[PDB]
Write a structure and sequence with these properties.
Length: 405
């Protein structure tokens, strides 16, 4: 349902890609997006869907634009424009140099030292969950594992009660892959209002949790305000609750459908870190963007001030110019090139936590439930958006084949 072509946009660059409902979604969501890398598709195209915006389709351009924050601003990073304008999460809605003071604070609460700290706890959350599912011979992996494992890890990190999980998870869904019940803005404001009273509790009586640290943080030589803390904690929550959740489901759908790749990791456990990186390339799932700060000529194309440009992080590693046979999963692939965690100054802060959650899941699942497949008669369906995902993943196994360590 398409917006009229802006005067400055050449009509031969039009390709009406809908990022929330792409044409070939039934073939798998990465497959659907990959059509933007067809021979007949330009390196930089314009879609009239979702209010109209640019799309960079190749890794070269995507990296280039994410590096140039002077022209491509993160102030309005979501499509549609109404979402992007409402978007005020910290650090992401800020450009350097102002972004950097807030990024250091956020890195304090989810960075590698924190993750090393939480290793034994992450390991047990996984094992407890899997040992509980193991004798049942079946699960809906998205809501039985993919959702609770990362989210309990985050609630742990944030010092938040697991009672609040249903409320919170719903809100984050609306911001990346909404049904239509709430706009981005009201979903975001709901999350903010959840966090305000907790932030104000913890400014006064400090702490070791992510919220306490953020609420007591110092930025620009001053205390962080309750409103800044809120904009940052909201982002950490969205980060903590929606991407890994979705990625685990892509990777497990794949392993469920490929006994060979399972047995490779079963037989060669040391390969699991390398396998994790190649899964991150193949089932890359993020796509947001930037907004033009001024009129600018970019690879032969005149971009105007206020134009929005989708720079799909997902597409870089599926680009056949960056990786040979991109849709093929090769755990021994020699140079794994992707931008799954982003590129430029907003490079994912949670990527060390994310890899840990992924690698612990692969290790602990295949150690206990080595053999499993898609439930008979089931057809897996994907969804698309800022963060694409899997709607459901019913898995089955013979409990007799399962192990206890
Ligand atoms: C598979 C897992 C994940 C993927 C693929 C992913 C992807 C990304 C991407 C592509 C960006 C850059 C977005 C942009 O440039 O606009 C980003 C940023 C960010 N991510 Fe992640 N993410 C993951 C997990 C996490 C986790 C677990 C957290 C934990 C809180 C997290 C927190 C953040 C934060 C705070 C930023 C903003 C950094 C900044 O703006 O400076 N992410 N993520
Ligand atoms: C695009 C993101 C994945 C990234 C910045 C966002 O707003 C996210 C949706 C959460 C954060 O990690
Ligand atoms: K904004």
């Amino acid at each position: 349902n398409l917006a009229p072509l802006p005067p400055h946009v050449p009509e031969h660059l039009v390709f009406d890609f809908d990022m929330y409902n792409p044409s070939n979604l039934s073939a798998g969501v990465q497959e659907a997006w990959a059509v933007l890398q067809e021979s007949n598709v330009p390196d930089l195209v314009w879609t009239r869907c979702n209010g109209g915006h640019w799309i960079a389709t190749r890794g070269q351009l995507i990296r280039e634009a994410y590096e140039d924050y002077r022209h491509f601003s993160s102030e309005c990073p979501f499509i549609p424009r109404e979402a992007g304008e409402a978007y005020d999460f910290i650090p992401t809605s800020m450009d350097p140099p102002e972004q950097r003071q807030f990024r250091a604070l956020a890195n304090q609460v989810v960075g590698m030292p924190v993750v090393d700290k939480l290793e034994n706890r992450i390991q047990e959350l996984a094992c407890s969950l899997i040992e509980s599912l193991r004798p049942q011979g079946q699960c809906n992996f998205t809501e039985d594992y993919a959702e609770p494992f990362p989210i309990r890890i985050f609630m742990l990190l944030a010092g938040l009660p697991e009672e609040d999980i249903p409320h919170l998870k719903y809100l984050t869904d609306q911001m990346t892959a909404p049904d239509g019940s709430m706009t981005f803005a009201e979903a975001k404001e709901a999350l903010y209002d959840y966090l305000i009273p907790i932030i104000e509790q913890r400014r006064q009586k400090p702490g070791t949790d992510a919220i306490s640290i953020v609420a007591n943080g110092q930025v620009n030589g001053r205390p962080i305000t309750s409103d800044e803390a809120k904009r940052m904690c909201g982002l950490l929550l969205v980060g903590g609750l929606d991407t890994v959740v979705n990625f685990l489901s892509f990777s497990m759908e794949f392993l469920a459908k490929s006994p060979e790749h399972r047995q490779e990791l079963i037989e060669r456990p040391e390969r699991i870190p390398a396998a994790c990186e190649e899964l991150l390339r193949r089932f890359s799932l993020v796509a947001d963007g930037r907004i033009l700060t001024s009129d600018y000529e970019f690879h032969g194309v005149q971009l105007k001030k206020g134009d929005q440009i989708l720079l799909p992080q997902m597409l870089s590693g599926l680009d056949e110019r960056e990786n040979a046979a991109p849709m093929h999963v090769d755990f021994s692939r020699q140079k794994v090139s992707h931008t799954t965690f982003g590129h430029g100054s907003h490079l994912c802060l949670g990527q060390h936590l994310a890899r840990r959650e992924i690698i612990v899941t692969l290790k602990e699942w295949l150690t206990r439930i080595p053999d499993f497949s898609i439930a008979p008669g089931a057809q897996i369906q994907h969804k698309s958006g800022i963060v694409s995902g899997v709607q459901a993943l019913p898995l089955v196994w013979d409990p007799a084949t399962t192990k206890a360590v």
